[PDB]
Amino acid sequence: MGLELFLDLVSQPSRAVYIFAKKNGIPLELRTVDLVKGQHKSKEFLQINSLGKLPTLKDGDFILTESSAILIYLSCKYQTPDHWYPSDLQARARVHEYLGWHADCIRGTFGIPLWVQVLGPLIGVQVPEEKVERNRTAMDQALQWLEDKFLGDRPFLAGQQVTLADLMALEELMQPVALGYELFEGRPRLAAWRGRVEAFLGAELCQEAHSIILSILEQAAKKTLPTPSPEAYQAMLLRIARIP
């Protein structure tokens, strides 16, 4: 089986998967890949995943990418609790729906702050104020939608109990926070849903799942951060180039 999971705990979709696996207690070989360094671009890694993206899971000689795909697969193969990924048609539909919306309106919008504050200047590139602002108004714009649409009255985005949907959302949301953005400030619903999940995941897990990222802003200050490889240097420029 081997079952290895290549990931960097800085990447949020990496934490989401790492957390699910850990909490459900699934044997996994944690394969660290310094993203900031450019290891996911190493010839060796590309031999594992041509896309050079994290996280990617290798079960046997079957390599799979995409936290969602991974998360689901994992959940299935290991028959983890159903509340996680309900077999109920209506219930699972609600999960998928959020994941879809998540990829459209959450992923890629809530990761920008790290670029603006860390990765961006790491290679000398400074993000234009316009986008920096445009980004944040975009964020809360989406935080609200998330709040009264998915969260609404219920306790979770996908329904009545913690679900993959939550693990993704919060992990993705925690990034800006780790940079000093308190998106929960004036959103009791959010704060409460967050506090809820954190509650269900246990301080220990979360306390370690995060660690890396809440420290990063510092290694940034103190220049502990590694110099990106040219292959990562290029990927970085691309991503920054697409921040609207």
Ligand X SMILES: N[C@@H](CCC(=O)N[C@@H](CS)C(=O)NCC(=O)O)C(=O)O
Binding residues for glutathione: 40-41, 53-54, 66-67, 104-107
The yes or no reply on residue 104 touching ligand X (CB under 6 A) is: yes
CA-CA-CA-CA torsion sign (206, 243, 140, 220): positive
Interacting residues toward a second copy by CB under 8 A: 50-51, 62, 64-70, 72-73, 76-77, 89-90, 92-94, 96-97, 99-101, 103-104, 107-108, 134, 138, 145, 148-149, 241-244
In angstroms, the Cα distances linking 61 to 3, 47, 136, 162 are 9, 12, 41, 31
39 binds ligand X (CB under 6 A): no
* Nearer to a second copy (CB atom), residue 151 or residue 206: 151
Integer Cα distance of 139 and 135 in angstroms: 6
Q: What does the alpha-carbon distance between residue 141 and residue 15 come to, in Å, rounded to a whole number?
A: 24
Specify the residue, 160 or 215, whose C-beta has the smaller distance to ligand X.
215
Compare residues 95 and 235 and give the one whose CB is closer to ligand X.
Answer: 235
Q: Does 67 bind ligand X (CB under 6 A)?
A: yes
Q: How far is the CB of 149 from a second copy (least distance, A)?
A: 5
Output the smallest distance, CB 160 to ligand X, in A: 24
CA 122 to CA 100: how far, in whole Å?
A: 32
CB-wise, 13 or 176, nearer to ligand X? 13
What is the phi/psi pair of residue 125, to 5°? -90, 130
Closest listed residue to residue 103, CA positions, set 73, 137, 133, 142? 142
75 is a contact residue toward ligand X (CB under 6 A): no
Which strands, in side-by-side order, build the sheet including 56-59?
29-32, 4-7, 56-59, 62-65
Question: Which residues of the chain form contacts with ligand X (CB under 6 A)?
Answer: 11, 13, 35, 40, 52-54, 66-67, 100, 104, 107, 235
